[PDB]
């Protein structure tokens, strides 16, 4: 225990030496983004209860959403139509995911099972291809590496990597003290980051199964995590009501986004395609569009009666989908 | 304007909408309760009609209730409890026999009652192991005054009447514990939710009837607030 304290001070001292200049000072002379105004271009209705999760498809036209109703339903964003309606066995689901190939979707809940559904089949029905079991806590996030492999973060302080065809964990990631709330895959997919209630975010190598780095700058739990499009940085959303940008290579937080007006927690975070705009969803029923480089709020998306649980920016970057507990998820452009 | 295949897709969406609405109407019939008790509570025993998350469905007087019991989760329940923020009532169970753990039960009740997400929902409190409490009080080896100093300075309310065949000091202990819980319940004073205490033995003929008439009371109060009568 004594040796760990000395090593911990070395890491903090090493980080202080590298931090020669603040990113705010580095980016003092850049054009302000200005005031951005985005009006809701759609409102997808049909969920009869609170919406917990939503994920965009790769084609950017289709998305899947999960709700307390106990049904997973896929939308056609452009035409508002419902492509599918999938009845879930368990009503409680905190996460859903869309495969990169669009062939499968995943759902995770309090039933300690991540269920993979085969959308494209003969006989014209969505059928559960597998039930992934082995976690001892609720599944907070699931993300597909490819059509075969899926990573799931759980409330048992342990993230896992599954081979869907085998159905058994091929790797397991154990470094967290609190329940894991979020998981964000990198653009290259070779590594990822996870978020937990211990107020720490850790970088895990997928193949090796080891924690490369850990970042701690949050007072409270972190609910959502999103990699920067470059893949060399990420941002985290906490109940402290501060959104912090973290750097993989530098190994220190570069900047924190906070306003005295908002003391309410952050439910979701996403990065614009260029990475300049950080869209943070809040329990105060309004998502705030943050200029990441300068950390000045440039716009507000205020059209939700209840809390925004979900936020997702399309792969093309055209549209922003925000789900919420009022059972309406609105696509903004 | 609209292609034939897109028109057929719209028809499919409309059929899906009708199926979703029918399923929601079916779901609206059932009233959903959250059963929680940390340990030694008898949560499996409180309701005998029906026998990661364990779901028990029982129906009394032509109304069907669904009861959720979760065992896996640890002491920190903040993140999964927010899912159960629409339940009609939360059934809390405590064991009055164990005085050492009773303060922990009171702290748990305070945390759940004062939870921000669960402000609206009421609580049905079952004080369990009534026969064990009576036996311990009769024996007198355990002193509630020791675990709870305030018990020595207490007077049973004259308005309340003990049931026949119950001892006076025993009833004093029962009403002391009930008042201790009800004080935490009434401290907030919001009035949107109420704690309803019930004393339950290890085996009781019908606690489902108690849950049923209590749920009638909660729905009645909600309707009175809705119509602006109260």
């Amino acid at each position, epitope marked *: 225990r004594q040796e760990a304290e000395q090593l911990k001070n070395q890491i903090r001292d090493a980080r202080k030496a590298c931090a020669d200049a603040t990113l705010s000072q580095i980016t003092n002379n850049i054009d302000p983004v200005g005031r951005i105004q985005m009006r809701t271009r759609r409102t997808l209705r049909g969920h009869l209860a609170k919406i917990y999760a939503m994920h965009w498809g790769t084609d950017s036209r289709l998305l899947v959403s999960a709700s307390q109703d106990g049904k997973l339903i896929i939308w*056609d964003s452009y*035409t508002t139509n419902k492509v599918h309606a999938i009845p879930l066995r368990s009503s409680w689901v905190m996460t859903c995911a869309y495969a990169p190939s669009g062939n499968y979707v995943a759902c995770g809940g309090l039933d300690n099972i991540c269920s993979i559904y085969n959308l494209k089949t003969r006989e014209g*029905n969505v059928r559960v291809s597998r039930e992934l079991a082995g976690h001892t806590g609720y599944l907070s996030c699931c993300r597909f590496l490819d059509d075969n492999q899926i990573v799931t973060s759980s409330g048992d302080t342990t993230c896992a990597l599954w081979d869907i065809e085998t159905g058994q964990q091929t790797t397991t990631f154990t470094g967290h003290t609190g329940d894991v709330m979020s998981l964000s895959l990198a653009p290259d997919t070779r590594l990822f980051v996870s978020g937990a209630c211990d107020a720490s975010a850790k970088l895990w190598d997928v193949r090796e199964g080891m924690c490369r780095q850990t970042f701690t700058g949050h007072e409270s739990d972190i609910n959502a995590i999103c990699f920067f499009p470059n893949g060399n940085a990420f941002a985290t959303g906490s109940d402290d009501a501060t959104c912090r940008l973290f750097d993989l290579r530098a190994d220190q937080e570069l900047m924190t986004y906070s306003h005295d007006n908002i003391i309410c927690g952050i439910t979701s975070v996403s990065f614009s395609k260029s990475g300049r705009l950080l869209l943070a969803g809040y329990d105060d029923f309004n998502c705030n569009v943050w200029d990441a480089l300068k950390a000045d709020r440039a716009g507000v998306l205020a059209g939700h009666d209840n809390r925004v649980s979900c936020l997702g920016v399309t792969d093309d970057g055209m549209a922003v989908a925000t789900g919420s507990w009022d059972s309406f998820l609105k696509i903004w452009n | 304007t609209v292609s034939a*295949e897109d028109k057929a897709a719209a*028809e*499919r969406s409309k059929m899906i909408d009708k199926n979703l609405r029918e399923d929601g109407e079916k779901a609206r019939r059932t009233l959903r309760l959250l059963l929680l008790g940390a340990d030694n509570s008898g949560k499996s025993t409180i309701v005998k009609q029906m026998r990661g998350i364990f779901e028990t469905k029982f129906q009394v007087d032509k109304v069907n209730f669904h009861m959720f019991d979760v065992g896996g989760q640890r002491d920190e329940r903040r993140k999964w409890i927010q899912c159960f923020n629409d339940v009609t009532a939360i059934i809390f169970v405590v064991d009055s026999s164990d005085y050492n753990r009773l303060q922990e039960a009171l702290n748990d009740f305070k945390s759940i009652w004062n939870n921000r997400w669960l402000r609206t929902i009421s609580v049905i409190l079952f004080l369990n192991k009534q026969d064990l409490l009576a036996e311990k009080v009769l024996a007198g080896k355990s002193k509630i005054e020791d675990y709870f100093p305030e018990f020595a300075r207490y007077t049973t309310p004259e308005d309340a009447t003990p049931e026949p065949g119950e001892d006076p000091r025993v009833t004093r202990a029962k009403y002391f514990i009930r008042k201790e819980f009800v004080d935490i319940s009434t401290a907030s004073g919001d009035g949107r939710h109420i704690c309803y205490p019930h004393f339950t033995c290890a085996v009781d003929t019908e606690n489902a009837r108690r849950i049923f008439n209590d749920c009638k009371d909660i729905i009645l109060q909600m309707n009175l607030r809705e119509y602006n009568l109260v």
Partner: single-chain antibody
Amino acid sequence: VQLVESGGGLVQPGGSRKLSCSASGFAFSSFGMHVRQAPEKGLEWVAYISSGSGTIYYADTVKGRFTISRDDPKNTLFLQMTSLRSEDTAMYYCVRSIYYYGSSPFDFWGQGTTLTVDIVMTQATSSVPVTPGESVSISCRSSKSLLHSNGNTYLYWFLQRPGQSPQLLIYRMSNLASGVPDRFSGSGSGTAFTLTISRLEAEDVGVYYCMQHLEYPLTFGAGTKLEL
């Protein structure tokens, strides 16, 4: 998945008959159902029934004399025929189809029962000689552009082997139906389309039909036969 067709046979002109196609192995409620082929001529679309029987269309040739009905719990589909005419002799096929984003309608076709008693799509050639292993191109023209404003172009390529019902090769002029080899490719311009078969082999020989789905009625081209 199977569609077995029952009923047919000789009928005196002016009589009535009812054909039944029974579905097994797939969710019959989800699939909107349909197509006849005369003994010596290409296919022609007869009727269409949506999911839940909400919408019905008939071809003008058979409108007012035919009646299409589906029994969802039994899964059977019926075509009730009245005032049978000499032109109505054909091989009647029961075809499934599902319409959502990314769907592949007309994917499966039934066996067929013999009965004895508008956008114009043209195929330039009725017959085309082929050799094994050599690229073959079949072209089908359209009177009107099949490209809708949304970007989809509704051309379908169907292949009928000898002694076999038609099967879907390409849907919407580019997308390749599942279970079909990657040799078949669909290239298409506005009002002019082509199907290219590369490295042709035996069992890829048959009549290739081009269909439009921009608007009802659905018109089939006469189709270009391949002969080795």
